[PDB]
Ligand binder design. Sequence first.
Ligand code: MG
Ligand code: MG
Ligand code: MG
Ligand code: MG
Ligand code: MG
Ligand code: MG
Ligand code: MG
Ligand code: MG
Ligand code: MG
Ligand code: MG
Ligand code: MG
Ligand code: MG
Ligand code: MG
Ligand code: MG
Ligand code: MG
Ligand code: MG
Ligand code: MG
Ligand code: MG
Ligand code: MG
Lengths: 125, 142, 203, 137, 34, 91, 92, 87
Amino acid sequence: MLYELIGLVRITNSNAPKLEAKELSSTIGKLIIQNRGVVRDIVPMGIRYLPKIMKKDQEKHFRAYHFLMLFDSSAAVQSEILRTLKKDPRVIRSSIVKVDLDKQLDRASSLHRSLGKKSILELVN
Amino acid sequence: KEEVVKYILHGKFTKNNTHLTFSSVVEDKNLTYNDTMLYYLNLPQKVKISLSTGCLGFRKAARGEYEAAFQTSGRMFELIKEKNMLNKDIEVVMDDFGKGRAAFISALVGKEGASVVKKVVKISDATKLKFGGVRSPKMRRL
Amino acid sequence: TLAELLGRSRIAQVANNHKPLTYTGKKFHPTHQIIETKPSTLYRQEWGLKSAIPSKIKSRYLVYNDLDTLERITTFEPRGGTQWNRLRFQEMGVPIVSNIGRQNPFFKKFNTEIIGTGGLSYSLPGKLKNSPNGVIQRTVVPGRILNLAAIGGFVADVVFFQSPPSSFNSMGDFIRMKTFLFEILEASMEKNGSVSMHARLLE
Amino acid sequence: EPLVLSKGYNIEEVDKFLAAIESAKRERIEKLEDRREAILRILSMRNSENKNAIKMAVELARKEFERFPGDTGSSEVQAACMTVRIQNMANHIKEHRKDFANTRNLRILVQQRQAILRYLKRDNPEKYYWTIQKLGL
Amino acid sequence: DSVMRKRKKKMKKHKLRKRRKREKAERRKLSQGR
Amino acid sequence: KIDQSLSKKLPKGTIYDPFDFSMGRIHLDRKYQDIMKSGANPLEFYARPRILSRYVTSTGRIQHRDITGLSAKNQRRLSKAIRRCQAIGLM
Amino acid sequence: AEIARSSVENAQMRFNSGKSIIVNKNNPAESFKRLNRIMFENNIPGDKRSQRFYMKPGKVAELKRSQRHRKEFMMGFKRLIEIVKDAKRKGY
Amino acid sequence: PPVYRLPPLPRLKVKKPIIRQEANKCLVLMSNLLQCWSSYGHMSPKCAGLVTELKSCTSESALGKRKSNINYHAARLYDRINGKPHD
RNA sequence: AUAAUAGUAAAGAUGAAAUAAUAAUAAUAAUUAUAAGACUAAUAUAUGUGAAAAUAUUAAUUAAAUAUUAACUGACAUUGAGGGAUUAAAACUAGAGUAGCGAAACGGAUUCGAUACCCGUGUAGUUCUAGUAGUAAACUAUGAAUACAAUUAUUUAUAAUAUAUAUAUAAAUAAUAAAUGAAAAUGAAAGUAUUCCACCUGAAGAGUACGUUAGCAAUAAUGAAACUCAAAACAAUAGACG
Ligand SMILES: [Mg+2]
Ligand SMILES: [Mg+2]
Ligand SMILES: [Mg+2]
Ligand SMILES: [Mg+2]
Ligand SMILES: [Mg+2]
Ligand SMILES: [Mg+2]
Ligand SMILES: [Mg+2]
Ligand SMILES: [Mg+2]
Ligand SMILES: [Mg+2]
Ligand SMILES: [Mg+2]
Ligand SMILES: [Mg+2]
Ligand SMILES: [Mg+2]
Ligand SMILES: [Mg+2]
Ligand SMILES: [Mg+2]
Ligand SMILES: [Mg+2]
Ligand SMILES: [Mg+2]
Ligand SMILES: [Mg+2]
Ligand SMILES: [Mg+2]
Ligand SMILES: [Mg+2]
């Protein structure tokens, strides 16, 4: 089951912002692969400012680093990945959402589909 | 240090009464980058002159009228002029669409708020609404 | 059969369209078939359509979309300005040639694009036009400056030696009132069917 | 079972197909193995939905019951197809007590099954009895 | 039923409810032990 | 000198008419006056606030189908996508 | 600190809501009018007015339906009168 | 676009024929004078001509100068313009 | 709601006023900072979806769902007494929860009076978890199914057309023809027909009493008679009245 992810990570360090994001991406990707899963794409997005001053437990955030991870897994695995994301202090907002494979097998991320490229083959070419 | 960046003119205009409030945005010139940026975003304010249209001797019902509201606005403007909080720029905000709101804006436009207008950088409404929330009172029969 | 006669007949001949009669966008060529009457037929309100047309219309020409609608009125507009633009263009006598090096389309599955000109000019470029005074080298045409110049039912790009201040700056945005003479250099026609004329202001 | 695939695939066939592709590429290792593993993970039952598993079970039931390869509406095969869904629906209900719409749906489904077995009994009694015995009824 | 006709029924229902309220202690006495 | 509202600027390649110079033409013009309409489900754009913000009022409200001028289904998809967006941080 | 200084109130502009406008010193009244228009478009005063009391959910649904109907009638009327005007213009 | 067909109505007619006439000159002058007297104290000679103009306007009567027939075309053409089905 | 900041005399309420956990113990308004519940702005049309109750912040899981083709089954169908399951709001029994609202109660107004309408405190209740109960203007006041009948306009989906055209289908929604109807009006049903179930036979008395069953209970279902009238009811008409 192809699940897209959107995590808005924390950026504490000013000079080197992407490090925490990169670590998060590594860890969640590691979890996925240990657990019968297959990460397809890890689309980065920019250091984008949040719409409002969004706050985690005993913290506050105005800017964050955004990224999509487009992975396959079981439902239980995914649910648990989501839970771990919710638990951790270095992400502000997390959101897993299903990508339906009833018609196709190759499906790109939501952003790529919006641009034009339906399958990841198109992106490759 | 205590540097006044700008003033904010707040006006809460309810059904029955107006509340005009002047306040200085006090920035200190003097830690993590994110924390500093957050501080810069939401600078502390200090109240300078509070005012409500009963302060101008309008008792009970007459304080829910713009005539009282207009007078209060004029008094506020006079206080601003005299007490000397006109050196930096001003930011107007409003609430709750009363009669007094209409009076306040008219006062600002006219000669009563002549000295203030030139420092007023931005008008910016901030009325509160609810996306569901607490249930309101039952609609009075009358 | 009747069906064959209907197919032949003059209402079937008018090719149908539901384009707006009021089109406030850019008009590069005619939208609708212009339809004239004779004066006699106008006098008894007959245009060769489904119904009689209102006696308020005194113009002989019109344009239409529907013979009859749900509103119980034919959708028409009493105007045939496009014929006059064509006639003006003919009078001006500036032959349209493709500025791109290509053969003239009139000589030698379906292509809906405009075959050369749309048929505003079937004139050929090689002719001169003599008169009592002599052979006309420069085509003299009166037009109006807008700010571009309106020259005989066409807007045209304009050029000059020096920009005249006395005529222009005296009435800055009432230049449309005063008619100025023009020397039309050439007329090119683009893919969209717009006639791109080029004139020169004479004084 | 451990190497069962979703989407109407078969693991033996998939491997053969991959080998054929490799041969074609050669004509025209670790990485290839990793890609194959990724493909298997994608097409595995345990990563896929329950719906695919149910569909597979229904297909299996049809294969078992079909009195010839073409027939799919055989009263017995219909009953068998109903049963798999009923089992799954029953399991769902056991998880979710107050889901009353889906209990109703289950109920309808077993009523339909009963009706078709009743029909089978009238038409062809021995066959009906055999079907019942198979289904555990 | 029009509204006017309904109003008689409503009134009857109200009267019945009142009677039940009145005869609560009496009803209780009657019910228990017999 | 004169304002822009009371003078119709005829484009370069266009045809005109005597009527076209008039006040009445200008009035007529005044009277008579996208990626989601193009034919792609708006629920691809839930990680694209920039594009979804076009279908939203200055405050943040979603615009009505009378305003936005969409197919009913396509409008509802757009609305869904917007709501998803604001559930996430982005938008 | 240096980084914060460099970010010269960049977020402050985009963070604020649409209920905000920069005043032209030549015409404050114009600015106020524009703000009022914006508020009207967003239906904020009308929303505020609605929120003063509670109305039973079926009753508010009925009201909403009635409003919708009224809207649709008005644009049907507009359509009709535009046709009438066209007919008048032409001669019908 | 979304067309909106009305039901069968008794009579197509503008509900209120607001004429939308221009505001009175005398009233405008009076408002201007009032605005001037807001500024510049009570009665300074900046508004010396304005007062005179107001007086001239309001000499014979307090106001200077003292209907839209759209019903006729709608009323006439309603039965035509209907998409009302046949009898 | 609590706390801090600075700041000054009223604030809050109403038709106008007061009473109150309002305020010279320093409030209200403002700006911050914590917590708590409960609700879900726009989109929205309840369009649609659901058997009906219902059902619009987001996501995931499991379940069910549309159309057209291909193949298969071979009348397996319809309706459905009894029966079964679900069934708004209020109510009740436990155990949490309790911001706002708010029966009752108390207080202030209003009034000749005011056990009210308005205002203030505000308990049950409203919220969740597990149940009980099985009623509502539970309404489209219209039981379900099938075959059929004259038009138009709207959308929605399907197919072909040479992706954007004008076409063929369905589906819904809105105007009607015919037909039906006490009329209002119904309009693919309140038409033409066929099938099956439920129910009605003057008004009062009465969905009352007695009885029985079920429920923790409130109650729910079942459901008479005497006595008394020539009444009682609906659609529409023209007035008078507001
Ligand atoms: Mg209260
Ligand atoms: Mg059955
Ligand atoms: Mg009845
Ligand atoms: Mg039903
Ligand atoms: Mg909503
Ligand atoms: Mg049945
Ligand atoms: Mg409800
Ligand atoms: Mg309850
Ligand atoms: Mg309780
Ligand atoms: Mg009370
Ligand atoms: Mg129950
Ligand atoms: Mg009852
Ligand atoms: Mg009942
Ligand atoms: Mg209901
Ligand atoms: Mg008839
Ligand atoms: Mg009959
Ligand atoms: Mg009707
Ligand atoms: Mg008995
Ligand atoms: Mg009972």
